[PDB]
């Protein structure tokens, strides 16, 4: 079950990670590093929208007599149209940044998928559904090396070429 067929209820401590099946059993485990980066980025996005790019504007309304109706209507028109402007700016920025947030998550998961394909090189078949059948036994020591990005493809290069050759 990979990322093309959907998300995982059961990814506990993160937004992106890996599901494996080996001989010692099955596991789901979050990717600490690609998750934290996404969180720093979305924390930047929120903090930019609610403060720093949230330039402050407070309504100043005065009183006017019955023959100051021109200045009354003008002062109220200033207040109304400037609220309308900050209100467009907030709704638009949210709408444009919502599209970008959704594209960032999509784009972050597909970057892990390719950081892992490049580590795995000739030792795993890309099943296309966002998975990898290895060409060698990948025990829990091997899996944790794929997860923490210490997987050297030379350690399993010959074993892989031999199992693959025979297919």
């Amino acid at each position: 079950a990979g990322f093309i067929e959907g998300g995982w209820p059961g990814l506990i401590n993160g937004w992106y990670g890996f599901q494996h099946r080996n001989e010692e059993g099955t596991g789901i485990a979050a990717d600490k590093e690609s998750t934290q980066t996404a969180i720093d980025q979305i924390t930047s996005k929120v903090n930019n929208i609610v403060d720093r790019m949230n330039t402050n504007f407070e309504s100043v309304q005065h009183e006017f007599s019955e023959i100051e109706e021109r200045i009354n209507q003008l002062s109220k028109h200033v207040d109304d149209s400037v609220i309308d402007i900050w209100s467009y700016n907030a709704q638009l920025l949210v709408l444009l940044e919502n599209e970008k947030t959704l594209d960032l998550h999509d784009s972050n998961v597909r970057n892990l998928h390719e950081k892992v394909r490049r580590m795995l090189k000739d030792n795993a078949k890309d099943e296309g559904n966002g998975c990898f059948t290895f060409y060698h036994k990948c025990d829990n020591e091997c899996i944790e090396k794929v997860r923490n990005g210490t997987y050297d493809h030379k350690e399993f290069e010959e074993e892989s070429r031999l199992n693959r050759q025979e297919i």
Binding site: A1, G2, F3, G6, G7, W8, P9, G14, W15, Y16, G17, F18, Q19, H20, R21, N22, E23, I42, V46, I49, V50, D51, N54, F57, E58, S59, H62, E63, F64, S65, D79, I83, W86, S87, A90, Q91, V94, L95, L96, E97, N98, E99, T101, L102, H105, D106, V109, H113, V116, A124, E127, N129, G130, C131, F132, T133, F134, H136, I143, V146
Partner: protein, 321 residues
Amino acid sequence: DEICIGYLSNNSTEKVDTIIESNVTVTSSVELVENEYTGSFCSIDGKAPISLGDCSFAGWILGNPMCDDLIGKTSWSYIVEKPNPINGICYPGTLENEEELRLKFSGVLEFNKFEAFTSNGWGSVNSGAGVTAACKFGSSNSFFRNMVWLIHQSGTYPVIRRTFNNTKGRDVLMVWGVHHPATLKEHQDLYKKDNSYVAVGSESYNRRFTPEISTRPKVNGQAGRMTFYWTIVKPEEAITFESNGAFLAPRYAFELVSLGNGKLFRSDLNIESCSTKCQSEIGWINTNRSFHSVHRNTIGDCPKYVNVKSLKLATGLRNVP
């Protein structure tokens, strides 16, 4: 033996929008906008506001005699007036530039009321009658406390003249008025002559005023009117009042002690003993959020008001099992 790459799917039922897609369920989203508020007036950083009780701005500044609950309300974070106060300019008339003075008081946080001219010190003239059914104290005939309505002594109203030397080192707000009697007779009986003047002059101010005698429809039983004036005497300015009648003479003035960002709310809501980071015309707002849509008319450290009741901002992923 195999490893897959994946993302989170979720119990989350929360939807957000983009320009190309509406009601897109996502793994998490924050609401940026705040809409809950309480509906009384609190203090801003522990500084209480004041109620004008049952008085207009004008009634408070002129000292409407039924506005005595207000004496010694001399500092505030802001001011609350009720929308239709019962005690206004009781003797029917107007305070010139009342709106400009209202704006001044948006910027005033503390005044100190003092006697600039003794009621008694105006010369051969009656400081003593100067009361009317329009401006009742209890059930008994009174007048605005901040000015005194001078009339003849023993059948003569002489030319009276006094000066206030502003030695306070701060802006003093001074008020006075001109009487517009209904008939020549009312003018004669009060100012024992046919036509009077009020002449007010400082290093910067200069105005003559005259009664305008005419029968207006009655208000508080009065066919006459009064027009009440104010000016700021700047520090080291002297201001001279000369008159031979129709003069509502200054008595009490206001030393403008602290300036700062204040407000005047018009509302029926009650001042309670609580604090708030943020106070709106219709209630106080207690929020960690940076946008709100409670009411635009706000004082304190406040979120940006916006028209929009909700901004759902996506944090999480698209969420699809």
